[PDB]
Amino acid sequence: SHMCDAFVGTWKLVSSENFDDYMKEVGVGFATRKVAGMAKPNMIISVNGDVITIKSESTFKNTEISFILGQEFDEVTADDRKVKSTITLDGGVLVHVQKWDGKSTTIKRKREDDKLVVECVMKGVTSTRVYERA
Ligand SMILES: Oc1c(Cl)cc(SC(F)(F)F)cc1SC(F)(F)F
Ligand SMILES: [Cl-]
Questions:
Q1: Domain residue spans in the chain?
Q2: Ligand 1 cavity residues, CB under 6 Å
Q3: d(CA 112, CA 115)
C-alpha cells in the first residue's frame, strides 16, 4: 500500500530530448518516428491494491498497461512492438524493462520536484521526457 502515491495522477508532457535518436535505436521506422515524436501525451497513473495502471493518451495512440510489480506481462507498444515487460520499484524509481527479438530497453520513471521524469534508454542512447501535473 501507498507504494506509488507520488506517481498517481494525470501528467502532461512538457519537454522531450533525444527521443528521435532513442526511437531510431529501438528500430522505429521513419513515419512512426515523425508522428510519435510530435505527440504530446498525457500519462495517467493509478493504483488499486497491488495493480498499477499507466495510460498514455495522445493524438498518436492511446495505450494502457496494468501490472503488478515484479510480475512479467505482455505489452504492445505504441510503435507496435510485441514485448515482454517487467516493472519493479528500485529505490523509489519505477523501472520498466521491455524485451523483444533479443533486444532490451529500459524506461525509468521518477518524481523530481513537481515533475515526473521519464528516462528511456536503448544501449548507449538516452531520451529524457519531462511531465508536469495536468
Ligand atoms: O511517450 C512514448 C513512449 Cl514512453 C514510448 C513510445 S514507444 C517508442 F519509443 F518506440 F516510440 C512512444 C511514446 S509517444 C506516445 F506516447 F505518444 F506514444
Ligand atoms: Cl525529443
A1: 5-132
A2: 23, 26, 28, 36, 39, 41, 56, 58, 60-61, 77-79, 107, 120
A3: 5
Cell of 21: 535518436
Q: What is the stated resolution of the deposited model, in angstroms?
A: 1.1
CATH architecture of the domain 5-132 equals Beta Barrel (2.40)
Ligand 1, from 55, 77, 119: best to mutate by most atoms within 8 Å of Cβ?
77
CA separation for the pair 107, 128 (Å, rounded):
10
End-to-end CA gap in the chain = 24
User: What is the SS3 assignment for 113?
Assistant: coil
